[PDB]
Design a protein around this ligand. Sequence first.
Ligand code: Q4L
Lengths: 412, 412
Amino acid sequence: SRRRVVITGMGMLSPLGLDVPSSWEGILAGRSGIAPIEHMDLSAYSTRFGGSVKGFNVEEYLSAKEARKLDLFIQYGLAASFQAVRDSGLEVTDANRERIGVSMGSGIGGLTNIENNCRSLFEQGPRRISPFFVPGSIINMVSGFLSIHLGLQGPNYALTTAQTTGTHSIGMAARNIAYGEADVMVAGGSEMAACGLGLGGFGAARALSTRNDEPTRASRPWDRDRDGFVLSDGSGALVLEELEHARARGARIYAELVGFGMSGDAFHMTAPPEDGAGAARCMKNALRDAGLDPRQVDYINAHGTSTPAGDIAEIAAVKSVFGEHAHALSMSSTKSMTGHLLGAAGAVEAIFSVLALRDQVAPPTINLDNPDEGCDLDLVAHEAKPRKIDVALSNSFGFGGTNGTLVFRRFA
Amino acid sequence: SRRRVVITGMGMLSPLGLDVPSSWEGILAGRSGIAPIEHMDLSAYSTRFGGSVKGFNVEEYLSAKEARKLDLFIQYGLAASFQAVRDSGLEVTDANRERIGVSMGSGIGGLTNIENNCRSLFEQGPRRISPFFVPGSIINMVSGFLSIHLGLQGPNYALTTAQTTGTHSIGMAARNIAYGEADVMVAGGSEMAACGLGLGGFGAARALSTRNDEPTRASRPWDRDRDGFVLSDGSGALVLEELEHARARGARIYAELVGFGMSGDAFHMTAPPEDGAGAARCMKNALRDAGLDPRQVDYINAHGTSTPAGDIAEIAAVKSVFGEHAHALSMSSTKSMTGHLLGAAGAVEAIFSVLALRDQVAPPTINLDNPDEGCDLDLVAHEAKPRKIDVALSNSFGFGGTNGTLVFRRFA
Ligand SMILES: COC(=O)N1CCN(c2ccc(F)cc2)CC1
């Protein structure tokens, strides 16, 4: 029957730091990781900024020889995965390697790589495509390369569900453990979509903030002056472990994963419904899955992308699910500070949610200077809010009307 | 315990036909779908042939306007998905729509969209990138578009596990139903990579047959003259359904999905281990999952890609798992006729495994003129073999060393 699942390891690259502690410090200090982009010439683009991972040294993890063959999203994926596994203290052996799997996902995967090889193809010809183009770019090779480097012979897969990838990856890996297909899973996501095709593609859709003259103030979830999301790079990985397995080896347990919801909206290709019906359905599924009174929820880490329609849908969804308790809980968007890591968003935000539970503090929504009409909940404007948090929830929504919710609680 | 899952609907686009019955006629006739690729300059490429979908009319499924927003791989996915639902006779209602979900995947995704948008970026600049570039290319849009068109509000996601995508998608969708997260799932995969980036990318790794003079003979799994796989396009979708739900509405049941195995090789980025250790573990996991002894297996639809290392590893795996039963079961590669649909291979081969059960016939491995060293199993060379089939296995092995097996059983 269904086993319990706990978090024993976390690892991260974000626009706020090259690990979990440095990233978390920036979160609690209300620091922005958003800055004009330096690694390409964007003068022709309507958005010229984002959340870059600054000063990443892949040779803390991999040989220059392997690193050259791999897209940054894979580099980032492996880095966060390696941190998470080291943080777990788990030893892989012949006795358990078949019970340890990996589900690290991406929205877009190796876009930089695909663009460069496409440029080689069109400017030169097919003879200049890297032999490493396919295994160095396709989304499933975070899971692939992690398994090859650590000897993980458990279930090995990747989700790709756009901005919901990291939440779904973590949720489905928990179900793997819950139902006994594995005892340990490394799960999360990674993204590096900051190339011509990425900023150009989101810019053509007019989805991005164009606040080029003040990048740190661009991402302003629930602010009346918000004008689209801010594109950010990075990775989140968690070690999910069956509870008896973690007890047996004396693992440090961060939190328990008690709840997971997915629901399709079936509303629109890219627009979330104004009334927040898909988020509501998803959160209700997750709270029922967790066997909770919705009044037990202390903290929500919102999707909070800084889009006009996305942000207000989330208020509606929370007011609908929590009724008067919507005024008691605290909800914030860490995207105020990190921007939108797309398929990695759920993964870093799952980690921030778990740390909200460890340290008993609601991360702020920075830049929330003029809350929009109906944005009247405790959104932890401007400053971190110490408070009791027994149950934390992390929401994600994506293109295709895809929804995910994760429910974490403090573990005794 | 656990609910039983049956197949009540199938849908397909392949190099052999625009639906299942046409495709299946081709399979049982030993027809090749492989031909020089038309409407494209492949002069500079070392491979100029593959399995294209011939004569596909997207306007049977979508408005010209909706189709123009979507990569071919998405059009192919929706085509198979729409056929499979229609085939099932399922009616979506306000009463069941939250119990019906989708997991349609892709290994490689939107190469044709990448090519066309890159063409515009490089020649004209980012202002010529399509506004639909991102939502029209992301792998989860077959799941998203299907769920929005039909009002499906169950689990909405997509897997990307390279050449294992179709097998994993179907398997994990079956788990969703077995553990009561959904009553119905549309699952499978789609792919359109037989284009410049795909031929180039796989060509660069010398993964492709270069037998340009005899395209129909290029795919020759376990033949001593094989020289790599044949790149092919298309899609498979199954309607998976809890048995009591299928019986209550009077559904036509093709077969029962009894077993799903996963494993990672944790061996190499592209090369299988020579003994097929990972494929062996995966097939053993899937048989344990089904509660079946290896001796009950009558037919295996092999991965059988026509690569030197791949075909031989699968012989090793089968001999290892099946011992003295390895020569009694019939094992064939339909890739001998279809080529390799990458992430859709496991979807179309799951359908061929099911129809092997309905029609009591092992599809041929065509082109097996000179079995290689060790290749002494019943590989159904040249001609379809009528025989007893109670239990069918479908295998998929992909980059990252990611493995999937599905076990289907006759239902009566
Ligand atoms: C070899 O190519 C790949 O593996 N691909 C194909 C392109 N894909 C994609 C996804 C989202 C998007 F907005 C733009 C492109 C996913 C990665």
